[PDB]
Amino acid sequence: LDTTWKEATLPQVKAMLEKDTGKVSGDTVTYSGKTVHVVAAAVLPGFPFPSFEVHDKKNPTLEIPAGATVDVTFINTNKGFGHSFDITKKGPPYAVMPVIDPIVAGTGFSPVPKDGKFGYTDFTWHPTAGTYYYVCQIPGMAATGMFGKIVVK
């Protein structure tokens, strides 16, 4: 797993969130091009706990073209928590301790927010076509809705 992290101030977090290259319609975010840039955050201020936000949407379904390089940036903005972002082929419902191996791409547990800053990381992903899920592995979070769907085709 990706377990290397950097720290960002709030202006840096805002700058990064705006680099998501998706296009929104309803609760779907659609990506296009040779390399696509997904920027996800764990519980942005005021969004429902527990959830991921991508392109300002709660747990949206990501539509990714087959053959694209997927550059994921994951930011943990939720004070007191160490959320992860892990992609799996296993769908819901998830147990309190989700059983989702193998994790095809994703992170360990993130640093908890500290010192006025937020931990984030970047990883790359080259999926085969199919359906995937992005899931948090902190106990109980996926069971209470902290996941979303990815369609690569």
User: Cβ of residue 29: shortest distance to Cu ion, in angstroms?
Assistant: 19
Helix (H) / strand (E) element for 14: namely: helix 10-17
User: Cβ of residue 109: shortest distance to Cu ion, in angstroms?
Assistant: 9
CA 102 to chain centre: 17
Binding site for Cu ion (CB under 5 A): 83, 136, 138, 141, 146
Can you give the length of the chain in residues? 153
To the nearest 10°, the Cα dihedral for 122, 50, 109, 8? 50
Whichever of 17 and 138 has its CB closer to Cu ion, that residue is 138
Whichever of 38 and 138 has its CB closer to Cu ion, that residue is 138
Q: What are phi and psi of 110, to 5 degrees?
A: -80, 155
User: Cβ of residue 31: shortest distance to Cu ion, in angstroms?
Assistant: 23
Whichever of 55 and 83 has its CB closer to Cu ion, that residue is 83
Residue nearest to Cu ion (CB): 136
